[PDB]
């Protein structure tokens, strides 16, 4: 097919503009019957939800916005890629979802990574001291520990923030592996848009990459 | 200056070959008097230590090897970049050290990332349950927690593994920021070698990039 590259608007709108545009696209997805046509419009809306979250950061928290669209991405992928009847378009659509989900998880981590590095040093120091203080020393030789409530909650949130990265790495490798089955399609998309970089591509780079991919999918799916 | 690109040997030697070559270069660094000439040879040895660690992975653990050369990288940077008399070569040498330290930290994380994702789910589940079980419920309304020793040590190691990534991200951004002060030098190095990718560049890619950079530094420093 003849490939065309989207011309992207340089205007930066407000979060409400993108949020209202995201809701209209999701409503279009809800009305549709076909799972692929639904999933395309769901990912289209997902891109607009990401734009609204990015608008929040450019204005002055995007964390709830990004978390809730991660949830929508998960629901979106359940519409189709592991199925035996899964088509090459389903796999391509899944790769685009995985790229968004991965980079969104990485953003969720980065928004609270200042907390993570402090907590890491404090937790490491307090865990070694609470373990030593719980175990009675035995001269001539050298089951439940108690910790402060503050250290407990610091541990809980530290696990939560670092988990977001753990998911970002795993989902990124998953996208990297699955694209091997559609190497030609995504080598072309990478050629036109430049490839997404895990630690370097900003939300706008991701938004345009995904929309350009959706453009080609609708062209192959003969949709509007 | 006229830039030349190193021709890299395609032979893959054993860990002992690279380890013995790394020790000889470090001994050369120890004998030298000049801090810059020492630091160049220290980073040269660091590259060979990395090659020995990579040889261990290609053979069949590289974790001690990589951790100990991270330590050598830290000592190496203390020889010079924040100093007021710091030259453009010191800053360039520091960027190369930071690239190695960052990617080595990321490798240290990746070697034990299977433990991290399991521990994340278990810790999250057990922390919420131990916190609820410690706090007495109060009908009509809806300081130190105790945890098993196994959950304690699982938390301790989970912090240790995820920390390695926290350092990798922070040191990578530090390298990214500092190269802005030497944008021309590293735009050229990136052009000849291809740019290092945080989550994608393997150890061999990093080894050659660093050695190519050291080549240019010795050329500008008029050293052998």
Q: Which residue ranges make up each domain of chain A?
A: 1-136+143-224
d(C-alpha B26, C-alpha B49), whole Å: 10
Computed from CA positions of residues B67, B71, B72, B73, in that sequence, does the dihedral angle turn out positive or negative?
positive
Long-range contacts of the stretch A176-184 (C-beta < 8 A, 24+): A178/A81, A178/A91, A178/A94, A178/A95, A178/A98, A179/A95, A181/A88, A181/A91, A182/A88, A182/A91, A182/A92, A182/A95
How long, in residues, is chain A?
224
d(C-alpha A74, C-alpha A84), whole Å: 20
Instruction: Output DSSP code: residue B78.
Output: T
Long-range contacts of the stretch A126-131 (C-beta < 8 A, 24+): A126/A151, A127/B152, A127/B155, A127/B156, A127/B159, A128/B156, A130/B152, A131/B152, A131/B153, A131/B156
Question: Do the beta carbons of residue A80 and residue A178 sit within 8 Å?
Answer: no
Q: Using DSSP, how many helices (H) and how many strands (E) does chain A show?
A: 8, 1
d(C-alpha A105, C-alpha B110), whole Å: 17
Interchain pair A145, B147: CB under 8 A: yes
Q: What is the CA radius of gyration of chain B?
A: 22
Interchain pair B159, A158: CB under 8 A: yes
Measured in angstroms, the resolution is 2.2
List of residues 6+ apart from B119 with CB closer than 8 A = B154, B155, B157, B158
d(C-alpha A87, C-alpha B68), whole Å: 48
Q: Which residue has the tokens 């000889």?
A: B24
Backbone angles phi, psi at B139, to 5 degrees: -65, 155
Question: Do the beta carbons of residue B198 and residue A200 sit within 8 Å?
Answer: yes
Q: What is the number of other CB atoms lying within 10 angstroms of the CB of residue B141?
A: 5
Give whole-number Cα distances, B67 to B58, B102, B103, B109, B116, in Å.
18, 12, 12, 11, 18
Strands (E), A129-199: 144-148
Alpha carbon of residue A147 to chain centroid: 34
- How near does any CA of chain A get to the CA of B171, in Å? 12
d(C-alpha A22, C-alpha A46), whole Å: 7
Residue B125, SS3?
helix
Give whole-number Cα distances, B80 to B28, B61, B87, B126, in Å.
18, 32, 9, 47
Question: Do the beta carbons of residue B76 and residue B130 sit within 8 Å?
Answer: no
Secondary element (H or E) of residue B191: helix B183-193
How long, in residues, is chain B?
224
Q: What is the number of other CB atoms lying within 10 angstroms of the CB of residue A187?
A: 11
Q: Which residue of A has its CA nearest to B125?
A: A156
Q: Which residue has the tokens 């131990």?
A: B130
Would you state the structure tokens that stand for residue A122, as one six-digit string? Answer: 């404090």
Residue B219, SS3?
helix
Cβ contacts below 8 Å, chain A against chain B, sum to 102
d(C-alpha B18, C-alpha B46), whole Å: 10
Contacts of A143 in chain B (CB under 8 A): 148-149
> Residue A113: which of A180, A42, A63, A150 has the closest Cα?
A63
Contacts of B197 in chain A (CB under 8 A): 197-198
Each residue of B175-190: b (16+ CB within 10 Å) or e? bbebbeebeebbeebe
Residue A39, SS3?
helix
Secondary element (H or E) of residue A106: helix A88-111
Give the nearest partner residue to A144 out of B149, B170, B200, using CB atoms: B149
Residue A29, SS3?
helix
- How near does any CA of chain A get to the CA of B117, in Å? 7
Q: Which residue has the tokens 């923030």?
A: A161
Q: What is the 3-state secondary structure (H, E, C) of B13-74?
A: CCHHHHHHHHHHHHHHHHHCCCHHHHHHHHHHHHHHHHHHHHHHHHHCCCHHHHHHHHHHHH
Chain B 133-192, residues with CB within 8 Å of chain A CB atoms: 143-149, 152-153, 155-156, 158-160, 162-163, 165-166, 169-170, 172
d(C-alpha B120, C-alpha B157), whole Å: 11
d(C-alpha B202, C-alpha B204), whole Å: 6
Q: What is the number of other CB atoms lying within 10 angstroms of the CB of residue A149?
A: 13
Each residue of B21-56: b (16+ CB within 10 Å) or e? bbeebbebbeeeeeebbbbbbbbbbbbbbbbbbbbb
Cα dihedral: A88, A94, A95, A101 (round 10): 180
List of residues 6+ apart from A181 with CB closer than 8 A = A88, A91
Strands (E), chain A: 144-148
Q: What is the CA radius of gyration of chain A?
A: 22
Would you state the structure tokens that stand for residue B108, as one six-digit string? Answer: 């240290």
Computed from CA positions of residues A103, A88, B202, A209, in that sequence, does the dihedral angle turn out positive or negative?
negative
Method: X-ray
Residue A178, SS3?
helix
Q: What is the number of other CB atoms lying within 10 angstroms of the CB of residue A113?
A: 17
> Residue B26: which of B10, B48, B55 has the closest Cα?
B48
List of residues 6+ apart from B144 with CB closer than 8 A = A146, A147, A148, A149
d(C-alpha A118, C-alpha A155), whole Å: 11
Question: Do the beta carbons of residue A207 and residue A51 sit within 8 Å?
Answer: yes
Computed from CA positions of residues A203, A209, A212, A214, in that sequence, does the dihedral angle turn out positive or negative?
negative
Computed from CA positions of residues A10, A16, A19, A23, in that sequence, does the dihedral angle turn out positive or negative?
negative
d(C-alpha A202, C-alpha A210), whole Å: 12
d(C-alpha B48, C-alpha B25), whole Å: 8
């Amino acid at each position: 097919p003849r490939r065309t590259k989207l011309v992207f608007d340089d205007r930066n709108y407000s979060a409400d503009h993108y949020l209202q545009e995201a809701k209209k696209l999701k409503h279009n997805a809800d009305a549709l019957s076909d799972r692929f046509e639904k999933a395309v419009y769901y990912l289209d809306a997902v891109v607009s939800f990401i734009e609204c979250g990015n608008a929040l950061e450019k204005n002055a928290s995007p964390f709830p916005m990004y978390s809730e669209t991660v949830d929508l991405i998960k629901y979106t992928m359940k519409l189709k890629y592991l199925a035996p009847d899964a088509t090459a378009a389903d796999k391509r659509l899944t790769v685009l979802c995985l790229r968004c989900e991965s980079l969104l998880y990485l953003r969720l981590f980065k928004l609270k990574k200042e907390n993570a590095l402090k907590y890491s040093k404090t937790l490491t120091e307090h865990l070694k001291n609470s373990y030593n203080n719980s175990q009675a020393p035995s001269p001539g030789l050298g089951s439940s520990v108690t910790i402060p409530q503050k250290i407990h909650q610091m541990a809980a949130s530290y696990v939560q923030v670092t988990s977001n990265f753990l998911y970002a790495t795993e989902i990124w490798d998953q996208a990297e592996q699955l694209s091997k089955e559609q190497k030609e399609f995504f080598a072309e998309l990478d050629k036109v848009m430049g490839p997404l970089i895990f630690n370097a591509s900003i939300m706008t780079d991701l938004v345009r990459y995904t929309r350009q991919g959706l453009h080609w999918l609708r062209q192959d799916a003969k949709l509007i």
